[PDB]
Point group: D2
């Protein structure tokens, strides 16, 4: 049993905690420590009453000022912004889950390793050559001495299994993407001062565009496509779920039905539990809480000229990404060294 | 001076009326008739107080039950759903502006021609071989005996000048698009019964995807690209403005700076007043009421492998589209036959 | 066992069907007929995939063009706007549930009685002296020969138990209310033509005010307060749940804690299952799907001058109102005559 | 001419700057200093492109890293969170406009007085006995040696003229209010950790209630009603404008038409430019940018039992409040001591 911790009890942290509360019996992981910038009275309320996933129902949530009782299970909790003053060796922490969006560097994330933690899994595309791993693509090829691992962004975590399937079946020369992304917490609500100008504007009002390198992270997790994948993101006023457009330029020519057939059988042989395949005419809010990290929308797949394919993929960047974080954490627990 | 009329005083009709009130002096067009399914007391209020373009300021709006006084200028108004019982020859109507979204067929739109109107300009991609014309691409090549002309959709009206510039400068083999579209009036507000299932769901809550053939309408207005352009649309909860992604596969290789240079000089030589070029980091709501039919977003243009280009274009599908409708109407007034 | 039917398979109809699917075993009601203006293929999809209550999970939903199989249970379905051409006696219908928002008159609703139905329960404040009944206030005092009964509006259905408790405990001279109401389907999405001007404007953008007489319906269901209760409504861009403010002028003086005590014990003795009492600092979306028809918000109750009380009550106007409709339907099944 | 400064270039600061740019010629005020936590390159962009008031049009906005050129007029700009290290005497500052929402205490706001400023006008209901003044009620009765003055909240600034008119004409025993308030910048966008739990939840999703003492601030600015006015606030997902409900218990009995007559003539004699009177059926977004600090909605005013009145007032808490701030600043410039 592996004692794990959570740095930053935000959206990813609350979803990680809720996922572990829903996957408790099959777990080699026991969550024993969290730390947020809030007191332990508030974040227990925010855990129980999520305005996106409704009221939690299965287990009882309560807290006092030093611990949080989730379903009778106790969990410790502290508050500090310095990662160096944190009781890790005092709590016996193998794996800490970096989820603050602050410690993306190696030198930032390694502060927990210095302060007495054994491995760190950071839920962000980290700066510098941090080894990145996506469940369903290359979650096998990590060396267990790599204590500082990184899951990529949610967009990369959705997009990379589709790109893996299409690269194996057809071969990819180039590829664009344009993810229509739900608004995240970084954007200011009203027009307030912010480091980047396109995130400074109002979130509920605007399609704000942004440039991301998270398309290039597929070139990290798939090495032979690096420098060939690039794309932008569009933040629109939907709170939870998002869709990603993906334009690839394959070289083995095909039609629109065949790529759907390929991804449909890949959903049932190899990418089971990663890619779901849906031939329904659903819309965005029917994917709040879906377990797969990419639902391929079947009716919109199209091919022009044989060698130019477009797919779109629904994905929940708050629930499915947390599911892949927890699956990667359990998969590194199963190969603990 | 050409006496013109408006069928359906909806969003496109109110914006058309507001544009003509802002372009009155240079106009060979006099708006003399409208008809909506509402009484003349209500739609004058809806003209004056638009919850998107604010309160109209320049001229005074009032009405009684038979006429509407806009700035002292009188305009007639009636209410009927049958187009065959309408006083057109009684009012002397050369051009009627079909904007109900109902009469898209030739046989539907020709009911006004039968009922005593001389030309009809329909603001929709019509079913059947109706001659379509976009201002800035092929607004010259209409024969003036074509009395039933069609402007295309707003997405096509934005996309086609960019595709014209890139086809002339580079040559296009294939091309995808994915427009992130503002929600239109056809979608039901709450989850209500509707003919298409993906428009049946809630508009303020959801990214609803839809399949459109309005990308193929570029293949109508540019003949040598027909059957090579296809794309989908994403309706997100923004009320007014929208952005269109466009992935083309050019064959003459280039870089990302050069296509920006080409479109920048095309903004200043030929597409002036059609395509604006913006090297600012703006967001969506800074294009409410822009006069150009496509603002090319400069910072997001990218080229992979030399022969694969992506542009994005902001466009207002309620104001700029009305501007192109009024420009096409004046341009057919200038070549009246 | 009472064979019941649903006129209009909208929000109230889908919620009624979902409630009966969740309360099947304790039911003397069997739903055997529905009719909407849509085909039976579409509304089964709209039943299964609600963008407000998520995907239905307990039972399987499928359909063909003549019947709908909900969890193996078959239900008939037809489509007609004329209520006089409907197979009621051909289907053996005791109680039809009017939920179209069209047939509010006695002469409108009695068309089903003429066409071969035995009782009609209309889910609207009907025009004319239709006997109105609220579960938890006067659901006992109906005569079973009254075949045309009316449940009131959702605002009245929330407000009247609180007014009953405060009138019994303190006595009420006068009383105002101002319900901050979620947007309903009647409002046009964009600024479109509509019979009332304040509902003609955009729903996602605006606090639209409206005048309602649903406060006066408390004076129907409580007779000694008629002509003493009046209030307005505010429609704000939230899709599901709503809150009602209520200012009463009591005459027996008291403090803010005592009215909370009175309503707390009334929640546990008489209004159990009607009024829930919450001393949490919750917000709106934590009441999506709550079973009570009024959650009294405890922290906001205030009394000025001893004789002037203000309460606020969360209530779900799409789920709890359907629950009260189904409870009234079962309660009229238990006293069938 | 009075050299003035702005602490905190947020919503109130940007609106104050935009108002002074629109009221330049009649001004004894010259804006010479601002300070925000952002660099001078960003906030000039945020001044020019407001996603609520559109693009500014009259004057040109540019900046470099030390000054901001607004229409040729230069203004200095700095960045510091400590108010004690600020160049006030180096810049010659008579009046600084506290708008950070941080320095609400006397000891906090007096740091600018210590650091070399002569008067401070704070745009918040300050803690402690800070002299508060509302334009249109008691903007005359300030002593010019009171260097630390406070404008109240926007809700109080709207509500107090109506309460002044109704107290003079009828006399008020008690009074409630319930303002349906637009969401402000303090609320977290997604469910994030926050000091108060009801502001911790999502802003675009929820009617979040909050308790405010800004109703009691009317008892400060009108002394004989203190301890008689109290109310709550409802934050709904509208970005800009808000409406306030107001229930008073008058003692001189009257009807609903007479209070409308009283406020209509008070709009034309004394409260001109403060209270506008509208007998239109407008909605919320037709008050974006209105100059009056309260638009009385005429059709909703109601009186029950003669001695119980309810009014509702539209008001823009981002533009009209800035107008009253600038009017108070000019009115203290006209009586400089
Ligand atoms: N938002 C999404 O849906 C999503 C999806 C994929 C990945 N991510 C990544 O997850 C990370 C966090 O996302 P989120 O939405 O939970 O962020 P958030 O800002 O909503 O929550 C982060 C939490 O961490 C706290 N925190 C920040 N710095 C801290 C510090 N130094 N010490 C302690 N606590 C600290 C914050 O105050 C907050 O409580 C970011 O890297 C984000 O890019 C987000
Ligand atoms: N919504 C946009 O931004 C946009 C952009 C480009 C093109 N268009 C096209 O413009 C058309 C109308 O758009 P809209 O937003 O104004 O539509 P709308 O539904 O908002 O308004 C249409 C108006 O026409 C009235 N009408 C409908 N049928 C009628 C009939 N038979 N007789 C008389 N009046 C009738 C409607 O009641 C309403 O008043 C559609 O074809 C749409 O696809 C819309
Ligand atoms: N919306 C709410 O939350 C709520 C709450 C309480 C009460 N109500 C009342 O419930 C009623 C319906 O509400 P809703 O939201 O379901 O309405 P809706 O408009 O969303 O759905 C009504 C359904 O009935 C159909 N219909 C209308 N006229 C018909 C006819 N003549 N024949 C057959 N089908 C017809 C409509 O097309 C639609 O399918 C209204 O009286 C409303 O005031 C609504
Ligand atoms: N939001 C409204 O519509 C409204 C209406 C009336 C009154 N007010 C009051 O106005 C004040 C500000 O409102 P806002 O919407 O502009 O706030 P905001 O948070 O949107 O903007 C405040 C600005 O001040 C900056 N700031 C904060 N602390 C600072 C410090 N110590 N030094 C320098 N800069 C600092 C912030 O970073 C931001 O740039 C608050 O007291 C608010 O209650 C707001």
């Amino acid at each position: 049993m592996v004692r794990v911790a959570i740095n930053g009890f935000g959206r990813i942290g609350r979803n990680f905690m809720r996922c572990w509360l829903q996957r408790k019996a099959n777990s080699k992981l026991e969550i024993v420590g969290i730390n947020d910038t809030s007191d332990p009275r508030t974040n227990a309320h925010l855990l129980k009453y999520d305005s996106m996933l409704g009221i939690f129902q299965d287990a009882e949530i309560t807290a006092d000022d030093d611990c949080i009782y989730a379903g009778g299970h106790a969990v410790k909790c502290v508050s500090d912004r310095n990662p160096e003053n944190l009781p890790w060796s005092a709590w016996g922490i193998d794996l800490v889950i970096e989820a603050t969006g602050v410690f993306t560097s190696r030198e930032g994330a390694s502060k927990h390793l210095s302060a007495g933690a054994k491995k760190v899994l950071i839920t962000a595309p980290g700066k510098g050559n941090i080894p990145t791993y996506v469940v369903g693509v290359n979650h096998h090829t990590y060396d267990p001495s790599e204590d500082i691992v990184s899951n990529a962004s949610c967009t990369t975590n959705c997009l990379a299994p589709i790109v893996k399937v299409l690269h194996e079946a057809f071969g990819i020369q180039q590829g664009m993407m344009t993810t229509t992304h739900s608004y995240t917490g970084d954007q200011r609500l009203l027009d307030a001062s912010h480091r980047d100008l396109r995130r400074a504007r109002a979130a509920a009002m605007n399609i704000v565009p942004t440039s991301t390198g998270a398309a290039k992270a597929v070139g990290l997790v798939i090495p032979e496509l690096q420098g060939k994948l690039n794309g932008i993101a569009l933040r629109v006023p939907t709170p939870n779920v998002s869709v990603v457009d993906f334009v690839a330029q394959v070289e083995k020519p095909t039609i629109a039905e065949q790529v759907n057939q390929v991804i449909k059988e890949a959903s049932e042989t190899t990418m089971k539990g990663i890619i779901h395949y849906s031939e329904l005419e659903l819309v965005s809010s029917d994917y709040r809480g879906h377990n797969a990290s990419s639902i391929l929308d079947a009716s919109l797949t199209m091919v022009l000229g044989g060698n130019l394919v477009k797919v779109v993929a629904w994905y929940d960047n708050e629930w499915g990404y947390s599911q892949r974080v927890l699956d990667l954490a359990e998969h590194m627990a199963a190969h603990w060294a």
